[PDB]
C-alpha cells in the first residue's frame with residue numbers, strides 16, 4: 001500500500017465550523033484537504049504537516065492539531081491501494097491560504113457542503129466523524 005497523510009484543517013468563523021478543501025490542478029480536479037505521499041525518511045505525521053505547509057501555506061505553528069482525532073481512508077490510486085491518514089487540526093488565526101502548482105482553488109466549507117464537494121463516501125463519513133469529535137471536544 002502507497003502511504004499518504006494530511007490534515008483536515010478547520011476554522012471557526014463567527015461560531016461556525018468550516019473545513020478547508022483544495023481543488024487539484026490536474027484532472028479529475030477533485031477536492032481534498034491538504035495531503036500527500038509520505039516522503040523518504042518520514043512517517044505519516046511528518047508528511048501531513050509538510051504537505052499542509054506545501055499545499056496551503058499553513059505552518060505547524062498556526063495550527064492546533066488534535067492528536068486524538070485521526071482516521072485513515074483507503075482507496076485505489078494508480079491501480080494500487082493507497083492509504084491516507086488524516087488528523088483534525090484547527091487553524092487558530094485568520095491566516096491566508098496560498099496554493100502551490102498542485103491546486104487551482106480552495107473553499108472554506110460547512111460540513112454538508114464539504115461532504116458534497118469532497119464527493120467520496122468514505123471522506124464524507126470521515127468528515128462526519130471529525131465534526132462529531134468537535135461537538136464533544
Ligand SMILES: Nc1ncnc2c1ncn2[C@@H]1O[C@H](COP(=O)(O)O)[C@@H](O)[C@H]1O
Pocket residue numbers: 027028030032073074075076077078120122123
Ligand atoms: N476518498 C477517495 N476515494 C476514492 N477515490 C479518491 C479519493 N480521493 C481521491 N480519489 C481519487 O484517487 C486519485 C488520486 O487522488 P489523490 O489521492 O487525491 O491524489 C484521483 O483520481 C482521485 O479522483
Ligand SMILES: [Mg+2]
Pocket residue numbers: 036037051
Ligand atoms: Mg507530496
Ligand SMILES: [Mg+2]
Pocket residue numbers: 034035036037051055102
Ligand atoms: Mg497532495
Ligand SMILES: [Mg+2]
Pocket residue numbers: 035036037051054055102
Ligand atoms: Mg502535495
Ligand SMILES: [Mg+2]
Pocket residue numbers: 036102
Ligand atoms: Mg506532490
Ligand SMILES: [Mg+2]
Pocket residue numbers: 016110
Ligand atoms: Mg457559512
Ligand SMILES: [O-]
Pocket residue numbers: 036037051054102
Ligand atoms: O506533494
